[model samples]
Target: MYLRITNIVESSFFTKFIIYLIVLNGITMGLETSKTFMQSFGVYTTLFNQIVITIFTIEIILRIYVHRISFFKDPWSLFDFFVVAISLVPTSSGFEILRVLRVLRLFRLVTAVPQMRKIVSALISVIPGMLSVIALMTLFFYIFAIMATQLFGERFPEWFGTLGESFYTLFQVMTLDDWSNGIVRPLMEVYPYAWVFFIPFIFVVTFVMINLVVAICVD
Candidate 1:
């Protein structure tokens, strides 16, 4: 009986079944977010969710049985354990965060699919190198934020009045979201060659630094 159960769990067919269930569960959760859909068919979605939870409970118990104590050793198994565990949380009034964590169950796809696991592992390995880059970027933000606070704080109190506000505005520019029309261009009306101030900062932070991070991750 143990060998038969083990064989079933190890098979490609069972893996596919779990993947499909995850997809269906994810779609149902997404539908629950829509007020119209929930109002019309919420009971059915709730029942489906309960059914999926039961299926996941059985799947995890089998995995735990097959692997025994060593099941906890693998990060993927630990992740599977927690994701499924979220569904079991009591949906009381104060436990809303735990209830919402049901969305995390969909993240099982990363562990279910081999390539996703490899890429996530690679990304995790690259995070160490990112520490230095993040520190450098923070230092740059500190220096520039201070400069912005000193330079524009009196005039543009909305964006650069305080050190935290300066940091927030610079972060917005770093992400290339409407920086020209909303920020720098308006500044240029007063300090015309403030181009000297912002142009290099944007290029270095947004273009150079961000692409460097992307290259490391993609490689």
Candidate 2:
């Protein structure tokens, strides 16, 4: 029965409609991401977005028609439906705040493609181990933040005046942004050898976090 249902879903017109909706949503998101384009044609973008939402609602209705409300017994289906439904809600302010949820439609690609489905399943299978690694990383970040506050606070008050400030600074460094102007340059102006604090931060955020996440994924 499960195999039959899967086969039908794979070949059905409803499935094709869902895939088309997903593609349309993705293209709309790409357009919205460009500030210049979005500002120039904001009204047209809103209209197009509304059309996409209407199509998505029809797609959800088809799914329920074919599979019954029990179709949402699966957690992923429920998640997909919730994301689509919430994103379609109208606002009097003409605000499309729920567009961010439309990004979840990318997951529909997993259903349409076999290789993506397998890769996502494999990634999910590693969740427990990955979560353990994430917990360890969080602990390391906390300890490092405390040490950074104590050693660098007097010189680089903006970056390390308190544990909270130290954590924020570390987050910015982790992105590999040019933190020198924001944190290190000022410290260097007041006192030399500020590189000692900055260098270690760069190493841990860039190298350590990268290697750790890769290692966790591998395991």
Candidate 3:
């Protein structure tokens, strides 16, 4: 009986069916984003979405029946269980926040695709090194945030007025979102040599430090 159930659960047809449902669920989510579409076909979309969830629930149940306690041991299977389980937590018009939590179902791809699971596993393996880099970054940011507050606080009240604001603005600059016309170009007008401070910081934090993380994650 157990072997038969395992065979059924492991069959290629079942795997493909689940993959189709995952993709279909994604489209349902996109449809849900548009109020007009929801007004027109919300009932059918939601019913279809619920049917997909039921299918996933049944799949998890079948796997559990086949594998027993071992089903809970595999990380990817556990991740699949988590994504499917969490999506069901929103009790169809429950808390507004919990209803929004349905978006997490999109993470089902982490389990649907083997390559994604491998990439996620690789990311988990690099956590220790990531923490070390995060610690170093925190210290570096602290020193620079203080220096920025002291140097530009008098002039740039909006950005560098407080220790907190300096850190926030510097982080925005580090990400290179709009360090030019938005913050730096204006600051340069005030302290013309501000480039002396900003340029090296950008090179160190954005270019050198961030790439080091990518290198470790890739390796």
Question: Residue by residue across 1-219, what tens digits does model 2's lDDT show?
Answer: 656555656576756767776777678778888999888898887888788778777767656666776877955667668877777665534556654555676777676555877888787877776666678768878987898798888777788899999898877777767778877787778768778877886786677667667877567
lDDT at position 171, candidate 1: 96
Q: Whole-model lDDT, candidate 2?
A: 0.74
lDDT of 3: 0.85
Q: For model 2, what is the error of residue 17's alpha carbon versus the real structure, in angstroms, after optimal superposition?
A: 1.9
Q: After aligning candidate 1 to the native by TM-score, how far in Å is the CA of 17 from where it should be?
A: 2.9
* Clashing residue pair totals per candidate (backbone < 3 A): 0, 0, 0
Angstrom error of the Cα, residue 180, model 3: value is: 3.6
Query: Which digits, one per residue and each the tens of the lDDT, describe model 1 over residues 1-219?
Result: 999999999999999999999999988888999999999799999999999999999999999889998899999999999988887887676668888888999999899999999999977888777778778889999999999999989989899999999999999998889999999999888878878989999878976686666868675
How many pairs of residues collide in model 1? 0
The superposed Cα distance between candidate 3 and the true structure at residue 32, in angstroms, equals 2.2
Reference-based lDDT, each prediction: 0.90, 0.74, 0.85
User: Which of candidates 1 and 2 reaches a greater lDDT?
Assistant: 1
What's the lDDT for residue 207 in model 3? 69
